[PDB]
Amino acid sequence: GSYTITAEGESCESARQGFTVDEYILPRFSVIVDPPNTISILDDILTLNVSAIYTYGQPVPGSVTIKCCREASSYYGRKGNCFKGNRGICTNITGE
Amino acid sequence: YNYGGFNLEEPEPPCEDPNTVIFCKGRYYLPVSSSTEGDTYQNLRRVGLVLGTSSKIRKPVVCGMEAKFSVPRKSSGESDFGSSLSNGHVETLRKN
Amino acid sequence: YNYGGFNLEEPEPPCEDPNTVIFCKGRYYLPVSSSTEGDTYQNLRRVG
Amino acid sequence: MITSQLATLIFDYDALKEFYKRGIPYLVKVILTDANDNPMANEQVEVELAGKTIGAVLTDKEGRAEYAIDTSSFVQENFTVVVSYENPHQCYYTEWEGPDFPTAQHFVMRFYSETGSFLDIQGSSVELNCGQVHNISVRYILSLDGMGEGATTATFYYLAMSRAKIVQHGQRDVHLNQSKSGLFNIGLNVTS
Amino acid sequence: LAGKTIGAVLTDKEGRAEYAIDTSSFVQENFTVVVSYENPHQCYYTEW
Amino acid sequence: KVQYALTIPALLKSGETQRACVNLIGYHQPLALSVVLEHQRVNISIFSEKVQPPHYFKCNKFMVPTVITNAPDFVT
Ligand SMILES: *[C@@H]1O[C@H](CO)[C@@H](O)[C@H](O)[C@H]1NC(C)=O
Ligand SMILES: *[C@@H]1O[C@H](CO)[C@@H](O)[C@H](O)[C@H]1NC(C)=O
Ligand SMILES: *[C@@H]1O[C@H](CO)[C@@H](O)[C@H](O)[C@H]1NC(C)=O
Ligand SMILES: *[C@@H]1O[C@H](CO)[C@@H](O)[C@H](O)[C@H]1NC(C)=O
Ligand SMILES: *[C@@H]1O[C@H](CO)[C@@H](O)[C@H](O)[C@H]1NC(C)=O
Ligand SMILES: *[C@@H]1O[C@H](CO)[C@@H](O)[C@H](O)[C@H]1NC(C)=O
């Protein structure tokens, strides 16, 4: 939780301070990815640079698969705009 | 100048009349002044100094074109102070 | 100047605009002029 | 995020003082960056003063384009400057029915001084180190019938307010070698 | 009739739907009637 | 003609040393200058100097008496 320190003195009024103490949980995996966070329309290649590490700094052999897609416009349908776009063209790649 | 409900402000200068025709070199001129301008009295009263100089520093204001505009307060400062200082971004405790 | 239906009058001078704020020494001034004044042009054009 | 406005132009609100002073040039400084916050190479930006393009200024290889509007004989009040990035080869696929090219407008006010004289300080956008005297710059216009004809010497008084204590005050005198304009540097002694 | 749906009438197998607005005690002057095809199952992908 | 300039900040901080700058100019004869912070009862002595040639741009330290509640005061 977040413990709070309070201090009363002859001159000060409240010396408040905060904690952020957390449960000491160590998930055995940690994946590091840095997305570009912004992509322009006239681009053809989206590069992902992914790594993954154990708790104690060890490489992790395994399969890394990425699936990226979206929707098209979702106008609303029926008395709005019945048939619209696609299910979103979803692509998929996998690597080792 | 407003510190603890104390104005400390000297009274406004007398208001001139908007119909006294005055001659310059050419045509016949009436006086006027806009509500919002900038002068030495407003490059002070923002840093917070007090002047007592006799020399003219304050803008002259004509009747019918006073400050009005109720309380023209914009963002006024571009402050970067705050609290919370955290998004979700859970970087869980991952080291001994 | 009107003699036998002939004006002989030079055309009126261009009209300035009533909103051009001009500075003198102190305050801020707009230009204006009365309809009826007296100048050299009406001190002549009466003698002829 | 899939973005559409490839090019963006902004007014860095550190310089670009909001009050303009007659006879002192008004600086316009514009930041030009694209997509994920990167500087641009040589690009032209149009500085429209009221409704007329007058500037046509190129950048300085880091998106720091600086233009000097001449302010002498400006007796307006509002004087809304606008900068646009006009080039019929960009790709600006707008979405929210806005203008069709990057644009930004600043709305300034006019500084008053009855005899006619203006003092401006060219501010600093970087922090100043301790123990190093610094030379913040001041521009000045000092018109006729002001301080008094025949005297080619003017003294500016200098004041620094740290927290609420007036500290490091000074006096700087200048010789009016040229007619009426110039710039003089304060030996500001920044100390802890 | 003016702002209230009163009829809700069905067609007659060839698109000739006929309704009879009752006019007794109308002392209005303009009385703009409007008809709409409301069924939240059809497709109206309008353009303009 | 004599032109003068007082400079002290609008909010003095009780119990800490401050400064006050005065900028007398224009006079020719030697002059007598006094700067006083008129407290409730007591007078302060920021400047009590004889003024000697013109261009008297001088600025001194002065110590504000401690006060427990923010109060308006006058400077003469
Ligand atoms: C990606 O995942 C989808 C899941 O439905 C699958 O159908 C598709 O075949 C995968 N991609 C490849 C290249 O196999
Ligand atoms: C200045 O005056 C004009 C007068 O038409 C007005 O449209 C404008 O909003 C005012 N303010 C600015 C910042 O231009
Ligand atoms: C600031 O620039 C002036 C220009 O002449 C120079 O005299 C002064 O030494 C400079 N101050 C520095 C570099 O700290
Ligand atoms: C700045 O002031 C300090 C304190 O009086 C002094 O020691 C230092 O020499 C000054 N700076 C310069 C460049 O003289
Ligand atoms: C002390 O202050 C009083 C006002 O309280 C005023 O007469 C003058 O400034 C000073 N007088 C003496 C005698 O010090
Ligand atoms: C104040 O100014 C006077 C002027 O005579 C001077 O003698 C004195 O050293 C200055 N400082 C203090 C703390 O009085």
XYZ file of C-alpha atoms and ligand atoms in Angstrom:
640
model
C 0.000 0.000 0.000
C 0.911 3.657 0.532
C 1.849 4.374 4.134
C 1.697 7.985 5.267
C 4.133 9.753 7.574
C 2.734 12.581 9.690
C 4.854 14.884 11.862
C 3.636 17.579 14.246
C 6.035 20.159 15.649
C 6.101 23.347 17.670
C 6.629 25.362 14.458
C 5.485 23.267 11.492
C 1.855 22.268 10.975
C 2.099 18.905 9.174
C 5.166 17.199 7.701
C 3.305 14.812 5.418
C 5.180 12.173 3.440
C 4.221 9.212 1.282
C 5.200 5.580 0.777
C 4.703 3.265 -2.192
C 5.447 -0.106 -0.621
C 4.619 -2.975 -2.956
C 4.413 -6.747 -2.780
C 7.769 -8.334 -3.646
C 6.504 -10.353 -6.602
C 8.960 -11.442 -9.299
C 7.329 -12.683 -12.510
C 9.714 -15.119 -14.157
C 9.481 -13.315 -17.523
C 9.798 -9.691 -18.557
C 9.363 -8.616 -22.179
C 10.842 -5.303 -23.342
C 9.309 -3.576 -26.365
C 9.643 0.045 -27.520
C 6.843 0.924 -29.943
C 7.353 3.861 -32.326
C 4.262 5.429 -30.676
C 3.458 7.274 -33.924
C 3.448 6.066 -37.530
C 2.893 8.178 -40.636
C 0.500 7.147 -43.397
C 3.059 6.905 -46.205
C 5.087 4.186 -44.465
C 5.498 0.581 -45.599
C 7.618 -1.059 -42.870
C 6.686 -1.094 -39.181
C 9.667 -2.335 -37.175
C 9.280 -3.975 -33.769
C 12.377 -4.571 -31.635
C 11.458 -7.058 -28.936
C 13.541 -8.677 -26.216
C 12.695 -10.821 -23.205
C 14.594 -11.662 -20.028
C 14.250 -13.787 -16.892
C 14.381 -12.292 -13.396
C 18.145 -12.846 -13.062
C 19.127 -11.733 -16.564
C 18.909 -14.801 -18.782
C 17.945 -15.229 -22.441
C 14.652 -16.978 -23.121
C 14.497 -19.362 -26.095
C 10.949 -19.667 -27.364
C 8.435 -18.494 -29.945
C 7.512 -14.811 -30.204
C 4.414 -14.086 -32.280
C 2.898 -10.689 -33.040
C -0.624 -10.004 -34.310
C -1.544 -6.471 -35.350
C -4.781 -5.098 -36.798
C -7.658 -2.689 -36.211
C -11.203 -1.816 -37.286
C -12.120 0.197 -40.393
C -14.691 2.893 -39.575
C -17.552 1.479 -37.462
C -20.143 4.056 -38.588
C -23.009 2.430 -36.492
C -25.243 0.333 -38.758
C -28.956 -0.221 -39.354
C -30.840 3.086 -39.728
C -27.300 4.411 -39.700
C -24.870 2.669 -42.048
C -25.687 -1.051 -42.214
C -22.751 -2.753 -43.957
C -19.366 -1.188 -43.307
C -15.677 -1.880 -43.725
C -14.372 -5.336 -42.911
C -13.629 -7.275 -39.765
C -10.298 -5.458 -40.000
C -7.575 -7.102 -42.056
C -5.586 -8.907 -39.377
C -2.040 -9.981 -40.194
C 0.256 -12.212 -38.183
C 3.940 -13.155 -37.972
C 5.966 -15.442 -35.719
C 9.663 -15.881 -35.027
C 12.296 -17.616 -32.941
C -0.409 43.823 -4.771
C -3.290 41.844 -3.216
C -1.733 40.111 -0.210
C -4.047 38.920 2.546
C -7.053 40.883 1.331
C -5.109 44.166 1.306
C -5.280 46.159 -1.916
C -2.198 48.393 -1.467
C -3.258 49.948 -4.798
C -3.322 53.690 -5.333
C -6.611 54.984 -6.776
C -7.083 55.084 -10.526
C -6.105 58.228 -12.458
C -8.861 60.693 -13.379
C -10.768 59.885 -16.566
C -10.493 62.308 -19.485
C -13.474 63.223 -21.658
C -13.926 61.752 -25.143
C -15.061 64.898 -26.977
C -12.360 67.537 -26.358
C -11.108 68.289 -29.875
C -7.320 68.682 -29.854
C -5.051 69.924 -32.661
C -1.767 68.250 -33.576
C -0.371 69.430 -36.917
C -3.028 68.484 -39.426
C -6.562 67.299 -38.836
C -8.797 67.631 -35.776
C -8.356 64.860 -33.256
C -10.525 63.297 -30.582
C -8.881 61.256 -27.813
C -9.304 57.506 -27.292
C -7.482 54.569 -25.710
C -8.085 50.829 -25.776
C -8.925 48.768 -22.702
C -5.906 46.443 -22.898
C -2.448 47.929 -23.409
C 0.945 47.535 -21.790
C 2.930 50.044 -19.762
C 5.380 50.340 -16.881
C 2.627 49.995 -14.285
C 1.846 46.562 -15.730
C 5.426 45.402 -16.192
C 5.421 46.122 -12.504
C 2.486 44.945 -10.371
C 3.452 41.642 -11.993
C 6.947 41.269 -10.593
C 5.479 42.840 -7.453
C 7.557 45.994 -6.906
C 6.264 49.296 -5.544
C 7.376 52.581 -7.106
C 6.813 56.043 -5.716
C 8.379 58.037 -8.530
C 6.785 61.324 -9.548
C 7.467 60.747 -13.247
C 4.515 59.617 -15.338
C 4.421 55.829 -15.677
C 0.763 54.804 -15.962
C -1.239 54.829 -19.167
C -3.944 57.482 -19.583
C -7.478 56.160 -19.939
C -10.446 57.954 -21.499
C -14.058 57.493 -20.432
C -16.155 54.888 -22.199
C -13.099 52.667 -22.803
C -12.178 51.533 -19.297
C -10.702 48.186 -18.267
C -14.073 46.342 -18.100
C -13.723 42.772 -19.451
C -14.668 41.459 -15.979
C -11.741 39.224 -14.969
C -9.492 38.525 -18.021
C -7.605 35.532 -16.608
C -6.018 33.088 -19.058
C -3.936 30.020 -18.167
C -1.617 32.659 -16.694
C 1.750 31.136 -15.967
C 2.385 27.880 -17.859
C 2.838 26.061 -14.548
C 4.506 22.647 -14.496
C 3.862 21.945 -10.805
C 1.363 19.302 -9.796
C 0.818 16.017 -8.001
C 0.073 12.350 -8.803
C 3.204 12.369 -11.015
C 2.535 8.840 -12.279
C 0.642 6.957 -14.981
C -0.275 3.289 -14.878
C 2.949 1.954 -16.441
C 3.441 -0.729 -13.795
C 7.181 -1.411 -13.686
C 6.823 -4.038 -10.988
C 9.668 -4.609 -8.549
C 11.989 -6.666 -10.740
C 15.303 -6.828 -8.870
C 16.754 -8.020 -5.569
C -17.042 79.750 -59.879
C -20.402 78.874 -61.484
C -20.689 81.203 -64.475
C -23.028 80.225 -67.294
C -23.495 76.636 -66.168
C -19.739 75.979 -66.061
C -18.306 74.642 -62.816
C -14.604 75.501 -63.302
C -14.137 73.730 -59.945
C -11.279 71.362 -59.268
C -12.476 67.974 -57.990
C -12.803 67.423 -54.265
C -9.743 66.087 -52.420
C -9.568 62.440 -51.320
C -11.403 61.486 -48.131
C -9.340 60.045 -45.280
C -10.652 57.240 -43.103
C -12.121 57.817 -39.629
C -10.431 54.938 -37.779
C -6.665 55.315 -38.343
C -5.291 55.724 -34.810
C -2.519 58.339 -34.803
C -0.048 59.323 -32.058
C 0.674 62.927 -31.105
C 2.550 63.202 -27.803
C 0.177 61.767 -25.243
C -3.050 59.896 -25.811
C -4.258 58.041 -28.903
C -6.188 60.027 -31.459
C -8.711 59.398 -34.202
C -9.184 62.008 -36.935
C -12.324 64.105 -37.434
C -13.339 67.419 -38.993
C -16.410 69.626 -38.833
C -18.696 70.098 -41.826
C -18.526 73.908 -41.675
C -15.123 75.529 -41.233
C -13.253 78.360 -42.895
C -10.039 78.193 -44.885
C -8.276 79.882 -47.783
C -10.510 78.035 -50.239
C -13.660 79.681 -48.876
C -11.864 82.982 -48.302
C -11.483 82.785 -52.052
C -14.225 81.263 -54.232
C -16.175 84.150 -52.700
C -14.162 87.021 -54.117
C -13.943 84.854 -57.238
C -1.085 5.862 -33.130
C -1.490 6.303 -36.890
C -0.944 10.006 -37.475
C -1.876 12.100 -40.481
C -0.427 15.623 -40.078
C 3.118 14.876 -41.205
C 4.424 18.412 -40.615
C 3.805 20.542 -37.518
C 4.840 24.115 -36.711
C 4.633 25.750 -33.285
C 5.425 28.971 -31.429
C 7.927 28.234 -28.660
C 6.349 30.259 -25.858
C 9.661 31.136 -24.204
C 10.799 33.851 -26.601
C 8.184 35.783 -28.611
C 7.273 38.405 -26.037
C 3.594 39.324 -26.037
C 4.021 43.126 -26.032
C 5.501 44.893 -29.056
C 7.348 48.200 -28.859
C 7.393 50.771 -31.645
C 10.726 50.979 -33.437
C 12.078 47.821 -31.774
C 11.891 44.810 -34.130
C 9.451 42.116 -33.050
C 11.002 38.643 -33.098
C 9.090 35.606 -34.344
C 10.713 32.240 -33.614
C 9.103 29.070 -34.954
C 9.765 25.374 -34.298
C 9.210 23.077 -37.283
C 9.092 19.333 -36.655
C 7.537 16.286 -38.290
C 5.876 13.124 -37.001
C 7.788 11.893 -33.943
C 9.494 15.160 -32.996
C 12.389 15.452 -35.421
C 14.025 18.574 -36.869
C 13.602 19.465 -40.528
C 16.075 20.462 -43.215
C 15.781 23.629 -45.316
C 12.102 24.578 -45.425
C 10.353 27.886 -46.065
C 7.726 29.374 -43.744
C 5.425 32.269 -44.631
C 4.976 35.020 -42.032
C 1.710 36.838 -42.738
C 1.464 40.010 -40.683
C -2.224 40.848 -41.085
C -3.342 39.541 -44.482
C -0.189 39.828 -46.587
C 2.777 37.478 -46.840
C 5.963 39.453 -46.237
C 8.523 37.102 -44.739
C 9.168 33.912 -46.736
C 11.911 32.809 -44.353
C 13.938 29.601 -44.576
C 14.875 27.486 -41.563
C 18.359 26.993 -40.081
C 18.666 23.176 -40.303
C 17.176 22.585 -36.827
C 13.651 23.999 -37.139
C 14.567 27.261 -35.407
C 13.374 29.797 -37.940
C 13.803 33.379 -36.753
C 12.231 36.383 -38.465
C 12.280 40.056 -37.485
C 9.058 41.933 -38.181
C 9.844 45.631 -38.506
C 7.575 47.425 -36.048
C 8.320 51.091 -36.758
C 5.147 53.031 -37.592
C 2.817 50.362 -36.212
C 0.074 52.171 -34.310
C -2.557 49.414 -34.476
C -3.738 47.547 -31.379
C -4.115 43.830 -32.082
C -1.660 42.916 -34.850
C -2.288 39.180 -35.119
C 0.769 37.506 -36.661
C 0.303 34.151 -38.388
C 2.905 31.672 -39.607
C 2.109 28.990 -42.146
C 4.114 26.157 -43.677
C 3.162 26.446 -47.337
C 4.652 23.975 -49.820
C 2.559 22.187 -52.461
C 4.534 18.969 -51.979
C 3.790 18.041 -48.350
C 1.241 15.432 -47.294
C -1.324 16.958 -44.927
C -4.289 14.561 -44.790
C -6.407 16.496 -42.320
C -9.176 14.817 -40.327
C -11.161 17.334 -38.246
C -12.130 19.697 -41.095
C -9.399 22.198 -40.242
C -7.113 24.179 -42.533
C -5.216 22.378 -45.274
C -1.693 23.346 -44.159
C 0.135 23.729 -40.833
C -0.689 27.119 -39.349
C -0.260 28.948 -36.049
C -1.331 32.425 -34.939
C -0.169 34.687 -32.115
C -2.113 37.703 -30.852
C 0.009 40.472 -29.351
C -0.526 43.815 -27.611
C 1.056 47.252 -27.855
C 3.411 48.873 -25.348
C 2.719 52.497 -24.404
C 5.205 55.215 -23.487
C 4.194 58.825 -23.935
C 7.461 60.527 -24.891
C 8.441 57.575 -27.087
C 11.068 55.225 -25.685
C 11.133 51.467 -25.275
C 13.258 48.946 -23.410
C 13.314 45.252 -24.302
C 15.172 42.292 -22.814
C 16.092 39.351 -25.031
C 15.180 36.550 -22.669
C 16.962 33.291 -21.944
C 15.477 29.861 -22.665
C 18.304 27.956 -20.947
C 19.180 27.628 -17.276
C 22.195 29.599 -16.065
C 25.087 27.919 -14.270
C 26.324 29.046 -10.870
C 29.560 30.981 -10.535
C 29.527 32.284 -14.120
C 28.779 35.938 -14.801
C 26.233 36.119 -17.610
C 25.466 38.727 -20.242
C 21.721 38.880 -20.829
C 21.087 41.392 -23.619
C 18.855 44.477 -23.691
C 17.698 46.397 -26.760
C 16.541 49.996 -26.505
C 14.975 52.762 -28.567
C 15.303 56.289 -27.181
C 13.520 58.788 -29.413
C 14.020 62.524 -29.793
C 12.449 65.005 -27.358
C 12.940 62.314 -24.715
C 16.037 62.326 -22.531
C 17.104 65.569 -24.226
C 18.895 66.497 -27.434
C 22.603 67.291 -27.332
C 23.570 64.667 -24.721
C 24.981 61.438 -26.167
C 24.901 59.485 -22.891
C 22.161 57.434 -21.238
C 22.225 55.473 -17.977
C 20.012 52.428 -17.383
C 19.463 51.223 -13.835
C 19.473 47.509 -13.165
C 17.645 45.394 -10.615
C 17.406 41.694 -9.798
C 14.799 40.131 -7.512
C 15.646 36.600 -6.378
C 12.918 35.486 -3.962
C 11.634 38.645 -2.291
C 14.965 40.404 -1.629
C 16.307 43.020 -4.013
C 19.806 41.705 -4.682
C 22.568 42.444 -7.222
C 21.527 45.934 -8.257
C 23.635 47.891 -10.713
C 24.002 50.824 -13.073
C 25.073 50.709 -16.726
C 25.836 53.827 -18.769
C 26.068 53.840 -22.566
C 27.494 56.362 -25.028
C 25.152 57.080 -27.949
C 27.853 56.740 -30.586
C 25.223 56.071 -33.248
C 21.988 58.043 -33.472
C 19.224 56.373 -31.453
C 19.406 52.544 -31.383
C 21.740 49.754 -30.340
C 22.155 47.115 -27.644
C 24.131 46.890 -24.421
C 25.001 43.885 -22.277
C 24.587 43.608 -18.504
C 27.336 41.888 -16.562
C 24.837 39.890 -14.522
C 26.740 37.975 -11.840
C 24.646 34.874 -11.183
C 25.571 33.499 -7.771
C 24.161 30.708 -5.609
C -49.093 16.153 -38.438
C -47.047 18.916 -36.820
C -44.631 17.248 -34.393
C -46.516 14.144 -33.269
C -46.875 10.757 -34.941
C -50.578 9.950 -35.135
C -51.149 7.597 -38.047
C -48.608 4.761 -38.318
C -50.381 3.274 -41.325
C -49.411 0.179 -43.314
C -49.201 -0.104 -47.094
C -51.581 -1.988 -49.403
C -49.267 -4.464 -51.209
C -48.356 -2.073 -54.047
C -47.087 1.076 -52.306
C -50.350 3.034 -52.325
C -50.706 3.846 -48.652
C -53.721 6.039 -47.924
C -54.413 7.796 -44.629
C -57.193 10.179 -43.596
C -56.123 13.033 -41.337
C -59.112 14.290 -39.366
C -59.355 18.031 -39.960
C -62.302 19.063 -37.783
C -61.351 21.871 -35.387
C -58.229 22.974 -37.256
C -57.985 26.761 -37.128
C -54.235 26.779 -37.845
C -52.902 28.259 -41.078
C -49.899 26.266 -42.322
C -50.299 22.676 -41.086
C -47.231 21.054 -42.627
C -47.764 17.291 -42.897
C -44.700 15.037 -43.031
C -44.418 11.335 -43.833
C -41.452 9.174 -42.927
C -40.470 5.553 -43.496
C -39.257 4.463 -40.072
C -38.063 0.864 -39.719
C -34.762 0.213 -37.919
C -33.926 -2.748 -40.163
C -33.394 -1.262 -43.644
C -30.280 0.361 -45.111
C -30.057 4.126 -45.649
C -26.385 4.926 -46.297
C -26.953 8.577 -47.096
C -24.358 10.658 -48.930
C -25.237 14.377 -48.955
C 14.214 69.375 -11.000
C 14.484 66.389 -8.640
C 13.350 62.900 -9.664
C 13.318 60.010 -7.215
C 12.708 56.274 -7.354
C 11.843 54.002 -4.437
C 12.121 50.242 -4.885
C 11.073 47.824 -2.151
C 9.070 44.639 -2.686
C 5.367 44.732 -1.926
C 5.484 41.818 0.555
C 8.234 42.053 3.142
C 9.179 38.764 4.801
C 9.152 39.110 8.580
C 12.337 38.294 10.450
C 14.659 38.299 7.430
C 16.947 41.000 6.082
C 15.725 42.775 2.949
C 17.059 45.535 0.726
C 15.710 48.904 -0.392
C 16.991 50.875 -3.384
C 16.625 54.653 -3.856
C 17.475 56.536 -7.043
C 17.636 60.293 -6.403
C 18.658 62.305 -9.474
C 18.453 65.814 -10.871
C 19.094 67.904 -7.772
C 22.187 70.116 -7.634
C 22.613 71.239 -4.025
C 23.507 68.782 -1.251
C 20.350 67.145 0.041
C 19.022 65.346 3.130
C 17.317 61.997 2.579
C 15.250 59.828 4.897
C 13.610 56.444 4.284
C 11.371 55.170 7.081
C 9.235 52.043 7.343
C 6.427 53.383 9.515
C 5.586 50.422 11.743
C 2.760 50.451 14.286
C 4.794 52.327 16.910
C 8.481 52.227 15.978
C 10.307 54.013 13.160
C 12.960 52.300 11.051
C 16.087 54.018 9.723
C 16.668 52.581 6.248
C 18.388 55.799 5.096
C 19.397 58.927 7.024
C 22.268 60.143 4.838
C 23.322 63.557 3.546
C 23.020 63.494 -0.244
C 26.231 64.410 -2.045
C 26.573 65.281 -5.721
C 23.728 64.044 -7.954
C 23.195 60.499 -9.264
C 22.505 59.033 -5.824
C 21.529 55.459 -6.726
C 22.140 53.717 -3.406
C 20.588 50.646 -1.844
C 20.808 49.309 1.712
C 19.827 46.370 3.895
C 17.178 46.686 6.579
C 15.749 44.258 9.122
C 11.953 43.959 9.391
C 10.598 43.500 12.938
C 8.989 40.124 13.512
C 5.196 40.004 13.236
C 2.861 37.077 13.882
C 0.031 38.162 11.544
C 0.287 39.748 8.097
C -0.199 43.481 8.459
C -0.182 46.596 6.263
C 2.619 49.084 6.830
C 3.685 52.368 5.271
C 7.017 53.580 3.891
C 7.724 57.318 3.958
C -2.162 -15.673 -37.158
O -3.193 -16.068 -36.238
C -4.444 -16.390 -36.863
C -5.426 -16.684 -35.753
O -6.747 -16.833 -36.253
C -4.255 -17.563 -37.818
O -5.486 -17.840 -38.476
C -3.181 -17.231 -38.845
O -2.937 -18.365 -39.670
C -1.889 -16.812 -38.148
N -0.885 -16.424 -39.125
C -0.181 -17.305 -39.845
C 0.811 -16.725 -40.807
O -0.341 -18.516 -39.727
C -8.381 42.730 -32.591
O -9.395 43.502 -33.248
C -10.078 42.811 -34.305
C -11.043 43.801 -34.916
O -11.763 43.228 -35.998
C -10.769 41.568 -33.751
O -11.388 40.857 -34.818
C -9.756 40.677 -33.046
O -10.419 39.576 -32.437
C -9.003 41.471 -31.983
N -8.003 40.644 -31.321
C -6.964 40.065 -31.939
C -6.044 39.265 -31.064
O -6.772 40.179 -33.148
C 29.049 38.689 -22.470
O 29.257 39.338 -23.731
C 30.006 40.560 -23.631
C 30.068 41.148 -25.021
O 31.152 42.056 -25.155
C 31.387 40.284 -23.038
O 32.070 41.519 -22.854
C 31.262 39.559 -21.705
O 32.550 39.185 -21.229
C 30.396 38.314 -21.859
N 30.228 37.645 -20.580
C 30.566 36.368 -20.371
C 31.134 35.636 -21.550
O 30.418 35.827 -19.281
C 29.981 37.615 -8.153
O 29.782 37.963 -6.781
C 30.608 37.223 -5.870
C 30.194 37.633 -4.477
O 30.529 38.991 -4.221
C 32.076 37.508 -6.164
O 32.890 36.725 -5.298
C 32.393 37.178 -7.616
O 33.731 37.560 -7.916
C 31.431 37.904 -8.552
N 31.676 37.520 -9.933
C 32.654 38.049 -10.676
C 32.762 37.535 -12.080
O 33.419 38.901 -10.234
C 8.366 58.578 13.649
O 7.169 58.202 12.998
C 6.131 59.168 13.200
C 4.845 58.531 12.726
O 4.537 57.370 13.486
C 6.481 60.446 12.449
O 6.270 61.562 13.307
C 7.931 60.423 11.978
O 8.056 59.604 10.821
C 8.872 59.906 13.071
N 9.034 60.901 14.118
C 10.077 60.919 14.954
C 10.080 62.016 15.975
O 10.977 60.088 14.888
C 23.747 52.645 4.096
O 24.031 53.873 3.429
C 24.925 54.690 4.200
C 25.030 56.022 3.497
O 25.680 56.974 4.328
C 26.274 53.991 4.366
O 27.113 54.788 5.194
C 26.092 52.614 4.990
O 27.325 51.903 4.970
C 25.035 51.821 4.227
N 24.795 50.529 4.856
C 24.281 50.363 6.082
C 24.117 48.942 6.534
O 23.962 51.309 6.797
